[PDB]
Amino acid sequence: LTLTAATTRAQELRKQLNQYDHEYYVKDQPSVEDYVYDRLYKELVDIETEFPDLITPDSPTQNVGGKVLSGFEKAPHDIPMYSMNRGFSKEDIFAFDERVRKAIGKPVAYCCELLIDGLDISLRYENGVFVRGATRGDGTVGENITENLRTVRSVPMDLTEPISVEVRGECYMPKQSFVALNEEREENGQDIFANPRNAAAGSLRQLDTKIVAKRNLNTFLKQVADFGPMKAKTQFEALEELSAIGFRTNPERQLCQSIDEVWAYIEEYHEKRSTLPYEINGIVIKVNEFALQDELGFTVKAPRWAIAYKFP
Numbered sequence: 001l002t003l004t005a006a007t008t009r010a011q012e013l014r015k016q017l018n019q020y021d022h023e024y025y026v027k028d029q030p031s032v033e034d035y036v037y038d039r040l041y042k043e044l045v046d047i048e049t050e051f052p053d054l055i056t057p058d059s060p061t062q063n064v065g066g067k068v069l070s071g072f073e074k075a076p077h078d079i080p081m082y083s084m085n086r087g088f089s090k091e092d093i094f095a096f097d098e099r100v101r102k103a104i105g106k107p108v109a110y111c112c113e114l115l116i117d118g119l120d121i122s123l124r125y126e127n128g129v130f131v132r133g134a135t136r137g138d139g140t141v142g143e144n145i146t147e148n149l150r151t152v153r154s155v156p157m158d159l160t161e162p163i164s165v166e167v168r169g170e171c172y173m174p175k176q177s178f179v180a181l182n183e184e185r186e187e188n189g190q191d192i193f194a195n196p197r198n199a200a201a202g203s204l205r206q207l208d209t210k211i212v213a214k215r216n217l218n219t220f221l222k223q224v225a226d227f228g229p230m231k232a233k234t235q236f237e238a239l240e241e242l243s244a245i246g247f248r249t250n251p252e253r254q255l256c257q258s259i260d261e262v263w264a265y266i267e268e269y270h271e272k273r274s275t276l277p278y279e280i281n282g283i284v285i286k287v288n289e290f291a292l293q294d295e296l297g298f299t300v301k302a303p304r305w306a307i308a309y310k311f312p
């Protein structure tokens with residue numbers, strides 16, 4: 001591809017994607033399906049990779065998420081919330097691996113999890129008590145949704161230990177509830193949600209706590225942000241320590257040594273994809289040890305120690 005072609009094409013792609021980002025991250029009402037958005041974003045990455053000069057501040061590859069809504073107390077994140085690099089093929093995963101084993105200079109162990117179609121949240125605890133629930137917003141300032149998150153049961157008020165921490169995860173709506181809700185939202189004359197994620201988001205990100213409580217929402221915690229007294233050193237460990245202290249966590253997790261294991265994992269759950277009561281849209285491959293995650297660091301937008309495969 002030529003430079004003169006790229007330039008004008010990137011222009012098309014940035015101009016489109018940032019409108020979609022506004023639709024999705026802000027309004028929670030996307031024009032286009034996800035597999036499309038990923039095609040167009042994947043294209044733009046390739047262009048900006050071939051021609052790093054075309055990278056601009058407002059490129060989607062540079063920001064995370066979107067702005068905060070009007071009537072919602074702001075929720076600053078002392079530790080940033082980031083996005084995640086994506087892959088779509090056997091090819092792409094083996095590549096990640098090779099790049100990671102290069103910069104680390106050895107083979108290393110990955111914790112595999114499922115990618116839940118849900119809304120990212122940040123939960124903050126102090127001496128065991130729940131104190132603030134936050135969206136991601138733009139990675140550094142989200143929205144205070146504490147009063148709404150209270151209506152979601154799997155979210156504990158009191159931990160099993162009187163510890164001060166902050167933990168990150170997804171809040172999703174099960175397929176059953178989802179369909180009931182769209183059906184529910186037709187005799188009303190109201191228009192549907194595109195998917196469980198946008199169902200979850202629209203429920204959580206409005207002001208009327210009473211009708212949030214009428215939806216069926218649930219949670220899975222993925223990551224520890226502020227550890228406080230927590231002793232976990234690896235991701236697989238962390239997950240058990242998250243269950244230990246009283247958080248819901250996805251049991252489908254699997255620690256994989258080699259990457260044939262990882263690929264087999266992805267095979268397996270491609271097949272079990274629609275066996276599950278919640279909509280899954282891919283797998284998450286994380287570097288297991290936290291010091292290794294510290295070694296690779298984050299990009300501007302995402303972690304280098306983690307990739308998210310997407311199904312076709």
Ligand SMILES: NC(=O)c1ccc[n+]([C@@H]2O[C@H](COP(=O)(O)O)[C@@H](O)[C@H]2O)c1
Binds near residue numbers: 082
């Ligand atoms: N309008 C859209 O269709 C739209 C826009 C932005 C993100 N998404 C979804 O969100 C993902 C990216 O979210 P993260 O920022 O957490 O990586 C995409 O891969 C896609 O599944 C969809």
